């Protein structure tokens, strides 16, 4: 009964904390990157794929949230 | 029985708020460099704009998950 | 009635509070950088206030989900 | 007797308080930057004032969600 | 039992406490900037003090909401 | 009997503690800048005293709300 | 019996501990500048001691109120 | 009836969330230094890549623990 | 019986001592990091640095009192 | 009841989670220093690598305790 | 009273954990600065080691209060 | 009642993981300073080694007390 609400709040806090981790990482990487761009306008493509890495964490969070939802 | 609707609601609120906080600190550390660069440039605001609007997908994920299981509610 | 009704309350309260926290932590740095740039230049005003106004989306999303979840009850 | 009302109250309190955190975090940077700018020239006093005062909408949202929850209880 | 009063009391106390947190974390940086400015300036005292005294509205709203919910009690 | 008295005690303690943290985080920075000024000046000592003195009002508000909840006890 | 004894003990402990935390945060930044000034000056040693030992009232008051509600138990 | 599955779920959920937070706060500094090095020379590309790709062992461990906790039910 | 009263008074005094320890620890951290450079460069201002390190200990010293008097009430 | 293994599982999850948080917060700075040194020096690769593999032990301890308490279960 | 033993045990663990993080915060700053000083001087080793050894009394108190509550167990 | 063993395992997790994050916070700055020294010296290797292995004591104290209370389980 209440276990449905418990697994829901658990997956919510899981994806939220993954969001915090990815947000802090993206913040620092983009903070360096935007300053880098002014000379690295040639190297913007490498900077973008450098930036794009940490979203795998919230991808895994989405995966675990989806399997917990399918547990219903 | 019941009593799980408040649990799922507080879960949705926690999830969306945490996503908002993460993208908030992301925007916080993007914006200073973006404003400095565009103040020195006055031309290249578009690249900073897209580079700055990219991290909204965290809020997107939060609102989709909240929507899907509150529709389940 | 039910205590779940008040759990709805703590739910959207947590949601709107965390969204407000994220918006404020963004607005601190972006406003500081923007006011520095506009004190230097005096002509970059438009980009400054649009950069400062873009993080409002977080709190509008928070209040929107709060309103739908309190219209649920 | 019903425990729901206390949940309403604590949710309102945490919501408005964490909105207060967001507002204070914004103010801590914007006020220092505006003080530096006005100490530099004093000509940008009104601009610094409006930049520092514009995040008050956060606690406006906090007080309105508190008001509507108080009306709900 | 009548456990309702404890919840509203911890709500008012929590809200006032973290409102004090927000106004204090603003007051730290604004006071540092203001005292540096008045150390140099000897004339910007009025603007420094009004900027420093501005953010007390946060705990003002905290005490107002505490009074309202106490009157509800 | 009723055990909500412990809950209102928790609320009072939380309020006064968080007020203490807010005034401490303000006092650290204002005192550091003040002592940095008075290390050379020695003439603005009263100004530094009143600047560090002012944020105590948060402690006064916290002790008043704790005291009125003690009267409620 | 009465679990309210446990709740009031928890409240007292958290209040005094978090007040101690805030006071440590306050004292850290004053001490860092004070010892640096004294190491070269050695003349403002007294004033440095007053500036560093000033913020004790909050923890002493927290201990006082803790003992008050302990004796109230 | 079942009572354990909800809190084992919140357990491994907060486990993987904390692991994600830790690897995020690591990757922040690591990739910042890496892109700073790359901004002046592209020869260190593979070294930067392996340095940033190193710290994911902790979230790998966390997700394996989550997998076995899911398998326990 | 309602024996859990003892358990949560124990956790309350634990919170008290732990948070007092954190406060005095961070204060000690900053004062030590400040004074170490002066004592490294001078080797003469040692007493002032030592006493400044000794001030924050009293914070946890009076932190422990609530814990052991709650144990006394136990 | 399964409540016992439920809170056992949330305990193991929290333990491994904050162990991962600790190793991340250490790994950030140590790896940043190592990356800077190896980028500007090209010769300190082994020393930097062993320095940043040194703090790996705490998550190993967390995994060890998790396995031993799972075996106890 | 088995449940009482578990509650006092988790109290001991939480207390020693906070003491542990406190001494970690101390040792980080003091040992980094001591490394810098011993690199510059290579003769102030005794002062650095006693400064590093000083803050461990907090962990001593934490483990001792854990031990005395274990004795009351 | 397995709530005893579950809660005492929760205490294990809190103690060891929180000591673990404490030692991580220490090791970050200690390793940063050690890398800074070894970048020029290469002879301070043993001193830096003992300097960063010195803060490892808190986690083994936590593991020892967790082991003894797990034996009490």
């Amino acid at each position: 009964g209440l276990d449905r609400g418990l697994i829901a709040v658990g997956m919510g806090l899981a994806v939220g904390l993954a969001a915090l981790g990815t947000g802090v990482a993206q913040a620092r990487i983009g903070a360096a990157g935007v300053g880098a761009i002014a000379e690295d306008r040639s190297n913007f493509g490498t900077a973008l794929i450098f930036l794009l890495l940490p979203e795998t964490l919230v991808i895994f969070g989405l995966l675990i949230a989806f399997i917990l939802n399918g547990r219903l | 029985g019941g009593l799980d609707r408040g649990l799922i609601a507080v879960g949705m609120g926690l999830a969306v708020g945490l996503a908002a906080l993460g993208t908030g600190v992301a925007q916080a550390r993007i914006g200073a460099a973006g404003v400095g660069a565009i103040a020195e440039d006055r031309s290249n605001f578009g690249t900073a704009l897209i580079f700055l609007l990219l991290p909204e997908t965290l809020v997107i994920f939060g609102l989709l998950i909240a929507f899907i299981l509150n529709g389940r509610l | 009635g039910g205590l779940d009704r008040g759990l709805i309350a703590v739910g959207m309260g947590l949601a709107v509070g965390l969204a407000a926290l994220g918006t404020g932590v963004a607005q601190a740095r972006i406003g500081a950088a923007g006011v520095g740039a506009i004190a230097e230049d005096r002509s970059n005003f438009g980009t400054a206030l649009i950069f400062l106004l873009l993080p409002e989306t977080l709190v509008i999303f928070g209040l929107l989900i709060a309103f739908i979840l309190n219209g649920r009850l | 007797g019903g425990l729901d009302r206390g949940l309403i109250a604590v949710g309102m309190g945490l919501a408005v308080g964490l909105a207060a955190l967001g507002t204070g975090v914004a103010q801590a940077r914007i006020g220092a930057a505006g003080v530096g700018a006005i100490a530099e020239d004093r000509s940008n006093f009104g601009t610094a004032l409006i930049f520092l005062l514009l995040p008050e909408t956060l606690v406006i949202f906090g007080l309105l969600i508190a008001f509507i929850l108080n009306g709900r209880l | 039992g009548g456990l309702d009063r404890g919840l509203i009391a911890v709500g008012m106390g929590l809200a006032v406490g973290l409102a004090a947190l927000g106004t204090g974390v603003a007051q730290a940086r604004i006071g540092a900037a203001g005292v540096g400015a008045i150390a140099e300036d000897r004339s910007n005292f009025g603007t420094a003090l009004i900027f420093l005294l501005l953010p007390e509205t946060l705990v003002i709203f905290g005490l107002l909401i505490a009074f309202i919910l106490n009157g509800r009690l | 009997g009723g055990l909500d008295r412990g809950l209102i005690a928790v609320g009072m303690g939380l309020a006064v503690g968080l007020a203490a943290l807010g005034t401490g985080v303000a006092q650290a920075r204002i005192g550091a800048a003040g002592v940095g000024a008075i290390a050379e000046d020695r003439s603005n000592f009263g100004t530094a005293l009143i600047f560090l003195l002012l944020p105590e009002t948060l402690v006064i508000f916290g002790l008043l709300i704790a005291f009125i909840l003690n009267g409620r006890l | 019996g009465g679990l309210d004894r446990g709740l009031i003990a928890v409240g007292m402990g958290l209040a005094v501990g978090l007040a101690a935390l805030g006071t440590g945060v306050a004292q850290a930044r004053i001490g860092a500048a004070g010892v640096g000034a004294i190491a070269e000056d050695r003349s403002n040693f007294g004033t440095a001691l007053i500036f560093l030992l000033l913020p004790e009232t909050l923890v002493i008051f927290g201990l006082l109120i803790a003992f008050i509600l302990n004796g109230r138990l | 009836g079942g009572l354990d599955r909800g809190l084992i779920a919140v357990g491994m959920g907060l486990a993987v969330g904390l692991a994600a937070l830790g690897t995020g706060v690591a990757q922040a500094r690591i990739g910042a230094a890496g892109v700073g090095a790359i901004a002046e020379d592209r020869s260190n590309f593979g070294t930067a890549l392996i340095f940033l790709l190193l710290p994911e062992t902790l979230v790998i461990f966390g997700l394996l623990i989550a997998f076995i906790l899911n398998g326990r039910l | 019986s309602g024996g859990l009263d003892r358990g949560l008074i124990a956790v309350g005094m634990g919170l008290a001592v732990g948070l007092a320890a954190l406060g005095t620890g961070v204060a000690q951290a900053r004062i030590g990091a400040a004074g170490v450079g002066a004592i490294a460069e001078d080797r003469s201002n040692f007493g002032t640095a030592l006493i400044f390190l000794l001030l924050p200990e009293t914070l946890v010293i009076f932190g422990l009192l609530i814990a052991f008097i709650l144990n006394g009430r136990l | 009841g399964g409540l016992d293994r439920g809170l056992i599982a949330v305990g193991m999850g929290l333990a491994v989670g904050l162990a991962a948080l600790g190793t991340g917060v250490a790994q950030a700075r140590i790896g940043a220093a190592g990356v800077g040194a190896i980028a500007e020096d090209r010769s300190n690769f082994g020393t930097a690598l062993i320095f940043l593999l040194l703090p790996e032990t705490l998550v190993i301890f967390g995994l060890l305790i998790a396995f031993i308490l799972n075996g106890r279960l | 009273g088995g449940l009482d033993r578990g509650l006092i045990a988790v109290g001991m663990g939480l207390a020693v954990g906070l003491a542990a993080l406190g001494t970690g915060v101390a040792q980080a700053r003091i040992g980094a600065a001591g490394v810098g000083a011993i690199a510059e001087d290579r003769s102030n080793f005794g002062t650095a080691l006693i400064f590093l050894l000083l803050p461990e009394t907090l962990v001593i108190f934490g483990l001792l209060i854990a031990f005395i509550l274990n004795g009351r167990l | 009642g397995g709530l005893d063993r579950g809660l005492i395992a929760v205490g294990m997790g809190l103690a060891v993981g929180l000591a673990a994050l404490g030692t991580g916070v220490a090791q970050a700055r200690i390793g940063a300073a050690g890398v800074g020294a070894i970048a020029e010296d290469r002879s301070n290797f043993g001193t830096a080694l003992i300097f960063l292995l010195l803060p490892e004591t808190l986690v083994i104290f936590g593991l020892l007390i967790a082991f003894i209370l797990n034996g009490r389980l």
């Binding site: - | - | - | - | - | - | 000033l54 004796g71 | - | 009076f62 006394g72 | - | - | -």
Partner: protein
Amino acid sequence: FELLVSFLNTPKYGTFDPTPVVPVFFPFWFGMIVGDIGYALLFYLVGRWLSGYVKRNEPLVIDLFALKLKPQVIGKLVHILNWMVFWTVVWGVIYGEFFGTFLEHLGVFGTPEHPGLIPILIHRIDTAKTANLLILLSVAFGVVLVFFGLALRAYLGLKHRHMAHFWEGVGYLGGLVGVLALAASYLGNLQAGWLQGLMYLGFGVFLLAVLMSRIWLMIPEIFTQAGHILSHIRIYAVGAAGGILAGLLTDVGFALAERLGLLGVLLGLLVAGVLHLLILLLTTLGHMLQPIRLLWVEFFTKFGFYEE
């Protein structure tokens, strides 16, 4: 004694000489702090060693601390440490627990829990009455010290015709009596008709003194002075910490003696002794640093020591 005062700022001509208060109070405070008879005997042994170092007039040098130190200040130190050991033993006789406890072995010692023909005035476990009595005693000590400081400042203002400072002092004591009366009435019994009048007159005197001191400054400093009065409570904190640490160490020794008194008691007692000496020195350094700091801040911030 006078060296600690001379370390601070020089007083101005015609002002009050604050020297004699410290010899009266500081050894008394330290005796209230420690009260350990055996550790006091250890300090007496240290003082005997320093007296021997006096009679071998060669100066004292420490390479680690860059210490250079002459026989006359050493003579002052051995005299003040003689005062230390005297006051701590004459307080530890009331605080009879020394090296922890010996009530488990001294049947002569008289307690309700363990009877004896010679009673012990102050117990440790009975914190119900003893703590309240010592807390009221300590706050009374704080009150009388702060009142003496305010009276000294008022007398100096009267003498030098700085009557604005005299008005400030009388307003300070009016606020003192008002807040003390209101707090005592709130915590105390009913029929506060005389207490209420005391609060009214204190508040009225404070308001009139503020009007004479019209420049509007000290009205938040009043609560700071109230906290300064309250600051004396840590004297019990330090002593209780030391006593309970000694008691738990003696409890460890007692546990060793009960289980394995045939063989393990020797190891238990030696480990207890070395732990006693090391933690006692490590904590009593701060313990002796505490009350001198207390008097330094509290008396001198109040009576007027700030001005050169």
